RNA sequence: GGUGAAAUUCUUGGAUUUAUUGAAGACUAACUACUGCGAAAGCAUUUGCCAAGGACGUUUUCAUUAAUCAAGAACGAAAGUUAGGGGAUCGAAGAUGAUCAGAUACCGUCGUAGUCUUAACCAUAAACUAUGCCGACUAGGGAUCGGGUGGUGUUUUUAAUGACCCACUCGGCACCUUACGAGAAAUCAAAGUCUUUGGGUUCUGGGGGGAGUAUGGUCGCAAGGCUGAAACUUAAAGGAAUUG
């Protein structure tokens, strides 16, 4: 009988400073050996957590964050932002009959030269005095709106850091900026940035990672 | 301390829920000692365990399943069995899982399950002690585990195209087995 | 303190898996399946077998020291059916009564944008 | 793993399951409807380039230039043929497991050709709205798609535009009620304006079998396509609807 938990060891995960509270929880690894060091088994190891926990506010409950472990010190694992996504039950609740679904996406490089891809979604809605049932839009409108949205996303990136972008997504200010630009074209509802996925990353330095923390 | 569950209601079920509301909460407030509230801001209901007098975690799950079933379209007095009995489950699938068919072929299939005046559906819900709802392409079956499987095999054969009369013959046999 | 794990439940026809891991998902605490707890094949999918599997896993979690657990529920998906069968529902009920604190719950069944061809030929096949 | 039940198969060198990544080929879910486009077959991720088209608007231009159509010609689902590429998935043929069990009675594993694409062929479907094209007239109604006109109307803002509301109008896919009409009846705004029988024009049928056979011709590499009898036999075959 091995009972491997004789050999396992526990570490604490420390989210970056951008988030309101940062004790994520624990993970376990076998005790280190001269043959191979444990710290190499900790590196990578993405963690996925509900944003409503990091912020302590349940209105965020349908959004999820990925964190990737990049550094180890003193049995604390120091970790960096890695992606954002919706929960699947929420997304199914938006799609309904008698309306149009609009999507846009673009790939772009941050000022600290991460390369990422970002997805936006929006839906048409009725005017308050409408009588006809189904609120569809013509294709000339859809192309126009999709062009507008693509422009905004490519200027909100080139924020000075990947961390500055994170500070934009939490208060979801960008949803309001898209709302203002499309105002003239068509009435829209449930404007959301749906997903963010990180494609490539620069040469590592500890300096930036320590600057994000104590 | 605290733990809670939240479940969304689709919009066509919203109005039936309000009309029933006065009948649905008393069993949750009384029998299970849960506390519950309706959140219109996010079109959901939320259920909370009161720490002072709840018995065991089975109370919290029983509450959720009862509300869950109602949003699928089962009647209130059919859903309520999930509080009082303990062996009930829901099975669900959609016709494209069995055979791919699209136009009037698709419409004819679900019409073959209903039968005239629902008589074919009504018969299956009697020869097997179960309840069935048809929501366009999707079928949901409520009952006991062994009963579920007997219902499923019969309805699958209707969408594969067997004539309704032949299936009646099979039901009489299955119903004889459940005389036990 | 709570020390959350995460429980992965995979329900299908023919069998049900119960599986639980560290929050990072790499290290596995315990597994076991319905088929391990019953004699005959025709029973591997039964809800009864699912309850036995869940009770067994929960005991070992307390022994290692996990006290709370997020849960991810999965059906076979792909070209197959997408909603977790009754075997998965039974497992979830049994975990709740174990005294573990259930965290958030999510459905993670894989869905295609649009699929490759389904098995069983043109004339259909009994699911 | 798979079934009604089970066996072939994979696995302590770690199967099934979990995590981080990568490659290939195919497909385009939900939104998706009694909605749109095209001569028909048919057509659904984003952006760019190329050329085409209907309806509307018009106090522009030509001035009978038109309708239908034997010969002749372009296109034509799926499967199929020849040569090159690609080859994830599913899978005629083939090799295999069980042969027990009446609801589940025909199920399991592997897999060639094929499924995708380029260059040439083939010319069939319940290719169906089972309703030939062009023109005129005969009835009531509220919905919807594209264009246009009007409004001292709502909203985006302090204009124009956009979104919406109300009235009218040209064109289109449909729907509900009724029958002065019609019909064998089911039913039908045409299937009406027919013994009170004539607006123009193309194609096809003449009781049931023998038979889409035989023979001749012609097209195709082939599979096959188009055209197509008679001797003889028989008193019915067939359509719609209700009912014992």
Swiss-Prot record, chain A:
Major subcellular location class: cytoplasm
The keyword Amino-acid biosynthesis appears for this protein: no
Subcellular location: Cytoplasm
Gene Ontology terms describing biological process: cytoplasmic translation; maturation of SSU-rRNA from tricistronic rRNA transcript (SSU-rRNA, 5.8S rRNA, LSU-rRNA)
Entry superkingdom: Eukaryota
Record GO cellular component, one term: 90S preribosome
Post-translation changes: N-terminally acetylated by acetyltransferase NatA.
GO molecular function: structural constituent of ribosome
Note: Present with 92400 molecules/cell in log phase SD medium. There are 2 genes for eS1 in yeast.
Subunit structure comment from the entry: Component of the small ribosomal subunit (SSU). Mature yeast ribosomes consist of a small (40S) and a large (60S) subunit. The 40S small subunit contains 1 molecule of ribosomal RNA (18S rRNA) and 33 different proteins (encoded by 57 genes). The large 60S subunit contains 3 rRNA molecules (25S, 5.8S and 5S rRNA) and 46 different proteins (encoded by 81 genes). eS1 interacts directly with uS11 and eS26, which form part of the mRNA exit tunnel.
Similarity field: Belongs to the eukaryotic ribosomal protein eS1 family.
Protein name in the entry: Small ribosomal subunit protein eS1A
Organism expressing this protein natively: Saccharomyces cerevisiae (strain ATCC 204508 / S288c) (Baker's yeast)
Full-protein interval shown: 20 to 233 of 255
Swiss-Prot record, chain B:
MF (Gene Ontology): rRNA primary transcript binding; unfolded protein binding
Keywords recorded for this protein, A-Z: Cytoplasm, Nucleus, Phosphoprotein, Ribosome biogenesis, RNA-binding
Domain KH: start-end pairs: 103-155
Localization in the cell: Cytoplasm; Nucleus, Nucleolus
Outcome following mutation: residue 111 to D: Temperature-sensitive
Similarity comment text for this entry: Belongs to the PNO1 family.
Function: Required for small ribosomal subunit (SSU) synthesis. Has a role in the processing of early nucleolar and late cytoplasmic pre-RNA species. Recruits DIM1 to nucleolar pre-RNAs. Indirectly required for cleavage at the A2 site of the 20S pre-rRNA, forming 18S rRNA, and at A1 and A2 sites of other pre-rRNAs.
Identification of the protein by name: Pre-rRNA-processing protein PNO1
Native source species: Saccharomyces cerevisiae (strain ATCC 204508 / S288c)
Highest classification ranks of the organism: Eukaryota, Fungi, Dikarya, Ascomycota, Saccharomycotina
Location of this fragment in the whole protein: 93 to 272 of 274
Swiss-Prot record, chain C:
Modification after translation: N-terminally acetylated by acetyltransferase NatA.
Biased composition (Basic residues): 118-127
Source species, domain of life: Eukaryota
GO MF entries: mRNA binding; structural constituent of ribosome
InterPro entries named among the record's database cross-references: Ribosomal_uS11, Ribosomal_uS11_CS, Ribosomal_uS11_sf
Region described as Disordered: 107-127
One GO location term (cellular component): cytosol
Localization annotation: Cytoplasm; Nucleus, Nucleolus
rRNA processing keyword on record: yes
PROSITE patterns on file: RIBOSOMAL_S11
Keywords: Acetylation, Cytoplasm, Nucleus, Ribonucleoprotein, Ribosomal protein, Ribosome biogenesis, rRNA processing
GO biological process assignments: cytoplasmic translation; maturation of SSU-rRNA from tricistronic rRNA transcript (SSU-rRNA, 5.8S rRNA, LSU-rRNA); ribosomal small subunit assembly; translation
Record PANTHER family: 40S RIBOSOMAL PROTEIN S14/30S RIBOSOMAL PROTEIN S11
Record's subunit section: Component of the small ribosomal subunit (SSU). Mature yeast ribosomes consist of a small (40S) and a large (60S) subunit. The 40S small subunit contains 1 molecule of ribosomal RNA (18S rRNA) and 33 different proteins (encoded by 57 genes). The large 60S subunit contains 3 rRNA molecules (25S, 5.8S and 5S rRNA) and 46 different proteins (encoded by 81 genes). uS11 interacts with eS1 forming part of the mRNA exit tunnel. uS11 interacts with snoRNA U3. uS11 interacts with MPP10. Component of the ribosomal small subunit (SSU) processome composed of at least 40 protein subunits and snoRNA U3.
Functional summary from the UniProt entry: Component of the ribosome, a large ribonucleoprotein complex responsible for the synthesis of proteins in the cell. The small ribosomal subunit (SSU) binds messenger RNAs (mRNAs) and translates the encoded message by selecting cognate aminoacyl-transfer RNA (tRNA) molecules. The large subunit (LSU) contains the ribosomal catalytic site termed the peptidyl transferase center (PTC), which catalyzes the formation of peptide bonds, thereby polymerizing the amino acids delivered by tRNAs into a polypeptide chain.
Gene: RPS14A
């Amino acid at each position: 009988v091995v009972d491997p938990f004789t050999r396992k060891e526990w570490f604490d995960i420390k989210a970056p400073s951008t988030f309101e509270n940062r004790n994520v929880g624990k993970t376990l690894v076998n005790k280190s050996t001269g043959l191979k060091s444990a710290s190499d088994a900790l590196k990578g190891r993405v963690v996925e957590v509900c944003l409503a926990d990091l912020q302590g506010s349940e209105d965020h409950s349908f959004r999820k964050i990925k964190l990737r472990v990049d550094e180890v010190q003193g049995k604390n694992l120091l970790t960096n932002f890695h992606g954002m996504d919706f929960t699947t039950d929420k997304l199914r609740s938006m799609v309904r009959k008698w309306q149009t679904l609009i999507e846009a996406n673009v790939t772009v490089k941050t000022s600290d030269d991460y390369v990422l891809r970002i997805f936006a979604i929006a839906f048409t809605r009725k005017q308050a005095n409408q009588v006809k049932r189904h609120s569809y839009a013509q294709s000339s409108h859809i192309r126009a709106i999709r062009k507008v949205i693509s422009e905004i996303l490519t200027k909100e990136v080139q924020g000075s850091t990947l961390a500055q972008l994170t500070s934009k997504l939490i208060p979801e200010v960008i949803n309001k900026e898209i709302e203002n630009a499309t105002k003239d074209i068509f009435p829209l509802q449930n404007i959301h940035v749906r997903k963010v996925k990180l494609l490539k990353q620069p040469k590592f330095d500890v300096g930036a990672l320590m600057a994000l923390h104590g | 301390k605290f733990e809670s569950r939240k479940i969304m209601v689709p919009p066509h079920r919203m109005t039936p829920l309000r009309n029933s509301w006065t009948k649905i909460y008393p069993p949750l407030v009384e029998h299970l000692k849960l506390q519950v509230r309706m959140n219109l801001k996010t079109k959901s209901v939320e259920l909370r365990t009161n720490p002072k007098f709840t018995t065991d975690p089975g109370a919290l799950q029983k509450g959720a399943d009862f509300i869950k079933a109602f949003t699928l379209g089962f009647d209130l007095d059919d859903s309520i069995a999930l509080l009082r009995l303990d062996d009930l489950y829901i099975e669900t699938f959609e016709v494209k899982d069995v055979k791919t068919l699209t136009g009037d072929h698709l419409s004819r299939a679900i019409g073959r399950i209903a039968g005239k005046d629902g008589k074919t559906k009504f018969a299956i819900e009697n020869a097997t002690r179960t309840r069935i709802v048809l929501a366009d392409s999707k079928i949901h079956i409520l009952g006991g585990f062994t009963h579920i499987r007997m219902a499923r095999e019969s309805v699958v054969s209707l969408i594969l195209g067997s004539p309704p009369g032949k299936v009646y013959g099979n039901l009489r046999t299955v119903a004889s087995r459940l005389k036990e | 303190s709570q020390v959350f794990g995460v429980a992965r439940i995979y329900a299908s026809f023919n069998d049900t898996f119960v599986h639980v891991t560290d929050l990072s998902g790499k290290e596995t605490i315990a597994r076991v399946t319905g088929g391990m707890k019953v004699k005959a094949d025709r029973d591997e999918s039964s809800p009864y077998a699912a309850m036995l599997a869940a009770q067994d896993v929960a005991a070992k979690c307390k022994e290692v020291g996990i006290t709370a657990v997020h849960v991810k529920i999965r059906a076979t998906g792909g070209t197959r059916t997408k909603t977790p069968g009754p075997g998965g529902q039974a497992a979830l009920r049994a975990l709740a009564r174990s005294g573990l604190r259930i965290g958030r719950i999510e459905d993670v069944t894989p869905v295609p944008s649009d699929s490759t061809r389904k098995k069983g030929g043109r004339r259909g096949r009994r699911l």
